Amino acid sequence: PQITLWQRPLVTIKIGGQLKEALLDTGADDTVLEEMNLPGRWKPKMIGGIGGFIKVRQYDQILIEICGHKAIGTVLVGPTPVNIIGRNLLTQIGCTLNF
Amino acid sequence: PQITLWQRPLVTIKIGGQLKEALLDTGADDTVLEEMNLPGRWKPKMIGGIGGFIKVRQYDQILIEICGHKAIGTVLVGPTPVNIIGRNLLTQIGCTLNF
Numbered sequence A, B: 001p002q003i004t005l006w007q008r009p010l011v012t013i014k015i016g017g018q019l020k021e022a023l024l025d026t027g028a029d030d031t032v033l034e035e036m037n038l039p040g041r042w043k044p045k046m047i048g049g050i051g052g053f054i055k056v057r058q059y060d061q062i063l064i065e066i067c068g069h070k071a072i073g074t075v076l077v078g079p080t081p082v083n084i085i086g087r088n089l090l091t092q093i094g095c096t097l098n099f
C-alpha cells in the first residue's frame, strides 16, 4: 500500500498472537515496543531518542507481522511512548520513501 | 526519488541561506533543527518521546528546500541530537511510505 503522512502512519501489527498499533518510523533505526512478554533470552541495549537515551531489552529472531507482511527480526522492549517499527523491519517488508 | 531504508534517509536541505543534512522522519510530528536563528517571532515549546522532553523555539511560516522541493511550515529549533524533517513538511513535498 501507499501511506500518506497527513496523520501518523499507524498500522496494526501482530506479535505473540496479539494485535497492537504501531508507528512506521523511518527515523528509528530499530523497532521498539511498549512493555510486553517475549520468549527467550534478551541482551541489553541503549537507544537515543528525541529526548535522550533509555535502556531497553533486545530480543532477536522474533516473529512479527506488520500490516499483513511477515517479518522475523530484532525487537526491543522498553519505555517508549508508542510502539515503533524501525528501519530493521521496514526493510524486511519492502518499505521505501517516495516523492 | 525513491529512498531506500537500508541506511538512514538523510538528505540535504536549504534553510535560511544554510545547507544542512537532515533525517526524513515519518515518526516525527514536527520538524526540529539544531540551534540556529530564524526570521520572525518565536514561542517556547516542549517536545518529547524516548528519553524525555526538550525545550525548543517554534518558528512559523518558514521556507525550507528539501531535496529540491520547496515547502513552508513550522520549524522547531533546539537541542535535537539530529536535524529532523517531520510529517508537517514531508506532506508538502508529496512524501509517502510504500510497500
Ligand SMILES: COc1ccc(CN2C[C@H](O)[C@@](CCC(C)C)(c3ccc(S(C)(=O)=O)cc3O[C@@H](C)CO)C2=O)cc1
Pocket (backbone or CB within 6 Å): A025, A026, A027, A028, A029, A030, A031, A032, A047, A048, A049, A050, A051, A081, A082, A084, A086, B025, B027, B028, B029, B030, B031, B032, B047, B048, B049, B050, B081, B082, B084, B086
Ligand atoms: C535506535 O532505534 C530507535 C531510536 C529512537 C527511537 C525513538 N524515536 C524514533 C523517532 O524517529 C524519533 C527520532 C529520534 C532521532 C534523534 C533519531 C522522533 C523524532 C521526532 C519526534 S516529534 C516530538 O517531532 O514528534 C518523535 C520521535 O519519536 C517518538 C515517536 C518516540 O520517541 C525518536 O525519538 C526508536 C528506535
